[PDB]
């Protein structure tokens, strides 16, 4: 019924540290501490027994060694390496592969995480409201250009538009069928997704029938809109993702945000 997922990979976007075969992205000393310590702490706080960790074709034992040595958890961890991933798809292809192991609801948490917010209250929220998908947003630095688009609705807290500004069309693009329903919408410019994901049981069947998932963000949560015509049959509450805002400093790392985390730490 209850299970947690840990996603692991290898760096490609960052400039420097990762080129060596011996040292991966999973075991990095930012400030005399491993990067995955925080995740472990979070998991401990949450209290869960069955946790399955996914890993690519590269590094098969190093991660295990890291898990073993130094480190508190005292839980049973299981690590697997499927040989189908080619980096060019990250975790969607893993998800598609592993399905009979899933019993109930599952929590998705990647390796790249810095956390300070209360842990259990997200889970509790997910449990209470009874929805398919949940994601979180945190503001960019205020202390001394186009980034990415988000929309918020509040009276229940729901997500409407989450498409990024990579291959951005010069004018604003929405839909009026998604606008006439929910007449009030607030445009967010500063907020950024911090890779926090919660998912339910009614998603396992759709993956085998129709594969459409991309980058775990582009089309993982984006197929939800039941507007205009509707042709695809739903599996048996309307298919809608949720979004909640937070004040405290907890952020992601992907682009040019690695030296700032150190600064944040040392004060």
């Amino acid at each position: 019924s209850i299970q947690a997922f840990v996603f692991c990979g290898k760096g490609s976007n960052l400039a420097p540290m990762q080129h060596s075969t011996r040292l991966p992205k999973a075991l990095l000393p930012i400030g005399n501490r491993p990067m995955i310590e925080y995740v472990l702490d979070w998991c401990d706080q949450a209290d869960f027994k069955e946790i399955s960790v996914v890993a690519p074709v590269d590094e098969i034992e190093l991660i295990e060694s890291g898990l073993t040595s130094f480190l508190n958890s005292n839980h049973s961890h299981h690590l697997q390496d499927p040989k189908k991933i080619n980096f060019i798809s990250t975790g969607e292809s893993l998800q598609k592969e592993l399905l009979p192991r899933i019993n109930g609801d599952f929590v998705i948490l990647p390796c790249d995480f810095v956390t300070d917010i209360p842990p259990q209250v997200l889970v509790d929220q997910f449990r209470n409201r009874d929805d398919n998908n949940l994601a979180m947003t945190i503001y960019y630095k205020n202390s001394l250009k186009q980034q990415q688009f988000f929309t918020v609705y509040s009276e229940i807290l729901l997500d409407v538009y989450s498409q990024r500004d990579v291959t951005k069309t010069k004018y604003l693009q929405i839909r009026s069928h998604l606008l006439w329903n929910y007449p009030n919408l607030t445009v967010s410019t500063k907020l950024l997704n911090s890779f926090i994901y919660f998912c339910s049981f009614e998603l396992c069947q759709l993956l085998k029938l129709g594969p459409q998932s991309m980058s775990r963000q582009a089309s993982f949560k984006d197929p939800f809109t039941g507007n205009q015509q509707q042709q695809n049959p739903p599996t048996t509450i309307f298919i809608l993702p949720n979004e909640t805002l937070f004040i405290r400093a907890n952020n992601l790392n992907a682009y040019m945000d690695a030296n700032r985390f150190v600064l944040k730490i040392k004060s």
């Binding site: 069309t169 010069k170 004018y171 693009q173 929405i174 839909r175 009026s176 069928h177």
Partner: protein, 128 residues
Amino acid sequence: VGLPYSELLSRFFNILRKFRIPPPVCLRDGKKTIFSNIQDIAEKLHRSPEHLIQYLFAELGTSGSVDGKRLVIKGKFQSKQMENVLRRYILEYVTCKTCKSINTELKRENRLFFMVCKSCGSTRSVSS
């Protein structure tokens, strides 16, 4: 051997070979892309309207119908990315090669489209 080569080289050397863009009058009242000015575009560039629609479809996943002059295309598409698309279609689906000319007419020549220039009369590939 280095005697019959110079002649060959010589032979090789011997054998060697826009204001038409209309202003798009479109307001950004979205949900469905409405192009009312497209008839003018079709006229000026000497084109059938359907081909442009097909091109648009190919470019981005859309579904609609032809109406006499005006288009009802599903999607909240703008007047700058659509403009970009239009520009693109006017650099690889209108321009020639042998001779750069103004007047290019459309002819349905059997299922795949092949257009002809009015100035000279040459068959050009219209698919990419």
